[PDB]
């Protein structure tokens, strides 16, 4: 019988390979709902005549 | 109005001398805000 949760040792003295990395994972899923979020646009100069 | 899930809200506000409940005249409503929600609505209530 074992307690599943274990602790991460965190100190600056640990080696570089085992240093903790903050990971941000973006989940991209295309559903049948109307699309909203899009990439950034670009505005150019306006000329007349 | 519900068009393909997009909600179109139209609003008009004018002061009026009407006696009870309705005036006599012609007034055209103006657009207010559009809500891209997409929820189905089969019933509604008022809030007091």
UniProtKB/Swiss-Prot annotation, chain A:
Resulting phenotype, residue 3 to S: In strain: Lambda/C.37, Omicron/BQ.1.1, Omicron/XBB.1.5, Omicron/EG.5.1
Effect of residue 32 to P: Increased resistance to human covalescent sera neutralization
Consequence recorded when altering residue 6 to Y: Reduced host ACE2-binding affinity in vitro
UniProt-annotated stretches for the region Disordered: 32-49
Listed result of changing residue 18 to H: In strain: Omicron/BA.1, Omicron/BA.2, Omicron/BA.2.12.1, Omicron/BA.2.75, Omicron/BA.4, Omicron/BA.5, Omicron/BQ.1.1, Omicron/XBB.1.5, Omicron/EG.5.1
Primary role: Attaches the virion to the cell membrane by interacting with host receptor, initiating the infection. The major receptor is host ACE2. When S2/S2' has been cleaved, binding to the receptor triggers direct fusion at the cell membrane. When S2/S2' has not been cleaved, binding to the receptor results in internalization of the virus by endocytosis using host TFRC and GRM2 and leading to fusion of the virion membrane with the host endosomal membrane. Alternatively, may use NRP1/NRP2 and integrin as entry receptors.
Subunit note: Binds to host ACE2. RBD also interacts with the N-linked glycan on 'Asn-90' of ACE2. Cleavage of S generates a polybasic C-terminal sequence on S1 that binds to host Neuropilin-1 (NRP1) and Neuropilin-2 (NRP2) receptors. Interacts with host integrin alpha-5/beta-1 (ITGA5:ITGB1) and with ACE2 in complex with integrin alpha-5/beta-1 (ITGA5:ITGB1). May interact via cytoplasmic c-terminus with M protein. May interact (via N-terminus) with host bilirubin and biliverdin, thereby preventing antibody binding to the SARS-CoV-2 spike NTD via an allosteric mechanism.
Protein name (record): Spike protein S1
The encoding gene: S
Residues shown, of full length: 488 to 536 of 1273
């Amino acid at each position: 019988c074992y307690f599943p949760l274990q602790s991460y040792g965190f100190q600056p003295t640990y080696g570089v390979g085992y240093q903790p990395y903050r990971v941000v994972v973006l989940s991209f899923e295309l559903l049948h709902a109307p699309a909203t979020v899009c990439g950034p646009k670009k505005s150019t100069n306006l000329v007349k005549n | 109005k519900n068009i393909d899930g997009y909600f179109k809200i139209y609003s008009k506000h004018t002061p009026i001398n009407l006696v009870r409940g309705l005036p006599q005249g012609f007034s055209a409503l103006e657009p207010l805000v559009d809500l891209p929600i997409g929820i189905n609505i089969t019933r509604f209530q008022t809030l007091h």
